[PDB]
Design an enzyme around this catalytic site. Structure first.
Site, PDB file in Angstrom:
ATOM      1  N   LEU A 120       0.822  -1.222   0.000  1.00 39.98           N
ATOM      2  CA  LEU A 120       0.000   0.000   0.000  1.00 39.98           C
ATOM      3  C   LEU A 120       0.837   1.243   0.000  1.00 39.98           C
ATOM      4  O   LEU A 120       0.339   2.308  -0.299  1.00 39.98           O
ATOM      5  CB  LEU A 120      -0.892   0.100   1.237  1.00 39.98           C
ATOM      6  N   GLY A 121       2.091   1.112   0.397  1.00 36.45           N
ATOM      7  CA  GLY A 121       2.956   2.250   0.617  1.00 36.45           C
ATOM      8  C   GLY A 121       3.979   2.071   1.737  1.00 36.45           C
ATOM      9  O   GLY A 121       4.408   0.944   2.081  1.00 36.45           O
ATOM     10  N   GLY A 153       5.523   3.951   5.633  1.00 36.83           N
ATOM     11  CA  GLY A 153       5.716   4.918   6.708  1.00 36.83           C
ATOM     12  C   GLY A 153       7.135   5.530   6.696  1.00 36.83           C
ATOM     13  O   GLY A 153       7.910   5.338   5.744  1.00 36.83           O
ATOM     14  N   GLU A 172       7.287  -0.608   5.794  1.00 35.22           N
ATOM     15  CA  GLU A 172       6.560  -0.910   4.568  1.00 35.22           C
ATOM     16  C   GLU A 172       5.144  -1.301   4.951  1.00 35.22           C
ATOM     17  O   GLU A 172       4.999  -2.013   5.941  1.00 35.22           O
ATOM     18  CB  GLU A 172       7.253  -2.053   3.835  1.00 35.22           C
ATOM     19  N   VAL A 173       4.133  -0.817   4.205  1.00 31.14           N
ATOM     20  CA  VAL A 173       2.771  -1.005   4.626  1.00 31.14           C
ATOM     21  C   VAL A 173       1.976  -1.767   3.590  1.00 31.14           C
ATOM     22  O   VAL A 173       1.949  -1.360   2.407  1.00 31.14           O
ATOM     23  CB  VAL A 173       2.108   0.330   4.972  1.00 31.14           C
ATOM     24  N   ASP A 176       5.382  14.216  14.060  1.00 28.83           N
ATOM     25  CA  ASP A 176       5.542  14.015  12.590  1.00 28.83           C
ATOM     26  C   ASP A 176       4.202  14.318  11.905  1.00 28.83           C
ATOM     27  O   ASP A 176       3.701  13.486  11.168  1.00 28.83           O
ATOM     28  CB  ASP A 176       6.089  12.610  12.232  1.00 28.83           C
TER      29      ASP A 176
END
Ligand SMILES: O=C1c2ccc(O)c(O)c2C(=O)c2c(O)ccc(O)c21
Length: 332
Positions: free
Chosen positions: A44-45, A47, A51-52, A155
């Site tokens: 999915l992407g 952080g 890794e997500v 963040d």
């Protein structure tokens, strides 16, 4: 002499009044699940350091999100789990559902309940004046909750706000840089992401607090109303502060430095120069003017201050005139 000390104006001592266990994450004991409870579906992407993946819990057919952590110090992983546990169920906080290792690799991963979103790169362009007030409002609920619980996010940026525009819902994600606030603690300034870093981080003032997140919020607000993503576009940490100084001016920046007796890196001597504080009208044009109002600018100006102490708290920000119509619409 050294730098003048500083304390948060609100929620100063909330961690002191808690059992040690609530903030003493180095001693937190983690029970690790089995990653074979989950089948990854797709990448999915990413952080800040992970890794997500989209996954399915096979024991109940539930859609989840799996964030596989890149090798970081063991206490930092304890810190994020403890923070997620402490904050669970609060308004607009991502929900941690499980913690596992891949039985073969030993590698740690966190499992969140699935929340679907529209990417900010696509979304910001479509937003109405009302929509920006609405979602800013929802963000501020997540910040005031975490601040009230002893925690700075550290963040805050568009990637870390997941918006389900179809349902008008949002979640603050990626808590891997978040810390417990304690009065007198000196924190690492190598946090946040460049365009959203507060002047405190850029000048190496270590005794900062919740108010860091509010600078980051103001950077975001600025990009949304001026239709300019990101608003302060520096090439590195030094140039990040040159670009703020040309908006806010150098006079307040040096007053800021004098007040807290901050030793400026010699490297700043020649690049900072001498700059006047600019009127916000300078950034208004035909493409963005529908999003800019006297209310928007007054709010914005009260977020983007060098002096961390003098910025709105989340709760003050929520009482601002800019939010009067969303407050009326909500309750009810
Ligand atoms: O749900 C998260 C999510 C949930 C909790 C997190 O801490 C996180 O970093 C993410 C995250 O990075 C993420 C992403 O980078 C791309 C798509 C996503 O759905 C996520």
């Amino acid at each position: 002499s050294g730098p003048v000390p500083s304390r948060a104006r609100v929620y100063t001592d909330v961690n002191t009044h808690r059992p040690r266990e609530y903030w003493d994450y180095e001693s937190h004991v983690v029970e690790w699940g089995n990653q074979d409870d989950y089948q990854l579906v797709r990448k999915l992407g990413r952080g800040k350091y992970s890794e997500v993946f989209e996954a399915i819990n096979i024991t109940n057919n539930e859609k989840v999100v799996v964030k596989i952590l890149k090798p970081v110090k063991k206490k930092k992983i304890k810190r994020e789990i403890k923070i997620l546990e402490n904050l669970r169920g609060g308004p607009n906080i991502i929900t941690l559902a499980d913690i596992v290792k891949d039985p073969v690799s030993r590698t740690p991963a966190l499992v969140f309940e699935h929340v679907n979103n529209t990417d900010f790169k696509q979304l910001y362009q479509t937003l109405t004046d009302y929509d920006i007030r609405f979602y800013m409002y929802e963000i501020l609920k997540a910040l005031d909750y975490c601040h009230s619980m002893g925690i700075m996010h550290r963040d805050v940026k568009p990637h870390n706000v997941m918006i389900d525009h179809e349902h008008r819902k949002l979640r603050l994600i990626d808590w891997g840089l978040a810390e417990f606030y304690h009065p007198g603690q000196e924190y690492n300034v190598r946090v946040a992401s460049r365009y959203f870093k507060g002047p405190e981080l850029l000048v190496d003032y270590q005794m900062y607090d919740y108010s860091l997140d509010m600078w980051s919020l103001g950077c975001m607000l600025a990009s949304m109303i001026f239709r300019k993503e990101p608003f302060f576009h520096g090439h590195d940490n030094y140039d990040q502060l040159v670009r703020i100084a040309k908006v806010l001016g150098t006079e307040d920046l040096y007053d800021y430095i004098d007040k807290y007796n901050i030793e400026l890196d010699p490297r700043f001597n020649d690049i900072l120069g001498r700059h006047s504080r600019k009127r916000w009208e300078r950034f208004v044009h035909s493409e963005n003017q529908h999003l800019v109002s006297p209310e928007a600018l007054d709010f914005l100006d009260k977020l983007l201050r060098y002096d961390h102490q003098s910025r709105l708290t989340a709760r003050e920000a929520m009482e601002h005139p800019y939010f009067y119509t969303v407050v009326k619409d909500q309750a009810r």
